[PDB]
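Students often ask why we bother predicting the structure of a whole assembly rather than each chain alone. The short answer is interfaces. A chain on its own may look different once its partners are present, and contacts between molecules only exist in the joint model. In this exercise we take five input lines together and write out one structure for the complete complex. Read the inputs first and try to guess which parts will touch.
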Amino acid sequence: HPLQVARCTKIIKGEDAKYVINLKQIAKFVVGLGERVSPTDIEEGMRVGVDRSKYNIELPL
Amino acid sequence: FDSEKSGDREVQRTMLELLNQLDGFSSDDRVKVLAATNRVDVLDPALLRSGRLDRKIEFPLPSEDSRAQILQ
Amino acid sequence: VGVNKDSYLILDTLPSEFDSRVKAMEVDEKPTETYSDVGGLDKQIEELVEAIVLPMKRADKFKDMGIRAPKG
Amino acid sequence: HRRYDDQLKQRRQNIRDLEKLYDKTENDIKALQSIGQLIGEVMKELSEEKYIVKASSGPRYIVGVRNSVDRSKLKKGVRVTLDITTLTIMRILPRETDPLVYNMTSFEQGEITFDGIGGLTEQIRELREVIELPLKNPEIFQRVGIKPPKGVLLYGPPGTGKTLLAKAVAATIGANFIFSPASGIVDKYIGESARIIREMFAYAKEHEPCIIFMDEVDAIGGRRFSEGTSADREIQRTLMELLTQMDGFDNLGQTKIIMATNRPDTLDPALLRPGRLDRKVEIPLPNEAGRLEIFKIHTAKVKKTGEFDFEAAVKMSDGFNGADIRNCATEAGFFAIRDDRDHINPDDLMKAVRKVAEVKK
Amino acid sequence: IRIFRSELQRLSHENNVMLEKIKDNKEKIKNNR
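Now the answer. The structure tokens for the assembled complex follow.
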């Protein structure tokens, strides 16, 4: 699915494919606890995205 | 002659943190920081001292016999 | 530094993962090169041995004299 | 059977150690229930109980007072802690906008002692009377009837006497050392003119025992012709602001302005008039006889021979100050490492001058 | 061997008091983070 925007707000998941990244320059988020690679679907697809800035393990999508 | 270090703080803080890291170990030979560029248009008295970048080493174009080894 | 999204309150620090490390930085452990590959610089190479290489070998000889070896 | 009493004592040691660790954990959990607030700066004073501020999280706001509000230490410009809920001032903080410990050098008292400034004692005693005396006992000039000088210009060769005299004034008096180089004001970038001098005046206003020092004034100076501006946009705004601080409604009585340059001709004549710069001290160039006391500071501090001759190396030295001879003493020990000696050969320092002459004059 | 057993029973329950005290704190600090 084409993604021109992605964001998430106040999501608690699990370390492994957690994402919870806000692509907007306001309230930037990262991902810790190791390294994971999921080029097809990281967690839910959809609002998972990258856009401008690189954050951790989000690169494969 | 420009104060633009205050305009773009990426250049200023890099130089400010550079002065603190060079002074961390003054007795140790395991801390060495060098640099290379095209020329020196600006002299900084703070960077000129024992334990920092001081001596100017110019690198002119290779000589006649020097090019024989590179072509070899 | 872990903080709240709403109240913006500091909770707990986080380990280093994405530091904005400025990638494409060349890291090479003990490369392979000799001063004989590029000739004609022996005038500058001697200056690189005197002010860098030789004080880098042993720092205890210069410490007994009370002076400080140049770091670059 | 009595040897088991040691296990009973070691068991109690674990109870007392963990109990102190669990008590610190509970206090850290209770600290998470605390509620922080925003931070801002007062733009304008509307009234006693109402202030016009500027929030860091948004545009300018107008807030009230909460508790422990001291109207004497809180006024227009004083940084405040803004309440996100009721829009009130929770606490009182000193005024800071641009970092004062990074772009400006601040250190406790001084660094360089009076040994490196030796030889200027004739001018040093006159410098202490116009600086050290009014900052400590202002009654000295009150009985005489003369006003204390604000600015004092220390000028000379570049790097010679500029650094030594700067840190020596703060060391003997006891006031903090403020180094504000002139290269950090005038720029080709838009802005960066008034905000530096105003906040520098605010820092010296909060902490009285401080003295401001500058460097490289020749770059921000010049008289042009009519004192107008052509490509002077950052030059003229700086020269006029320095005059309005001392002659304005609020000057620095506990802080003296110091400028460092080459020649006074590079300074705005508007700043040269009485009321701004009342003192000009010239830094001479030490000769072979003058530099004799220079090699007795840095070179004589390190390990040297008892037969070392200061007159042999001074003949090859040309215009070397206390900071310039640091490379001479560094290269002097470089020729002595081959002979395995813990001291400095007097003949090695003479050869070290030729190595320093490649950079220094 | 009946001497140290008197003070050992005290330190045994005092450890459970500190254990149950931090047990609710361990679950609380994880919920506060």
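Check your guess against this: Chain B touches chain C at residues 22, 26-35, 50-55, 57-59, 62-63, 65-70 (CB under 8 Å).
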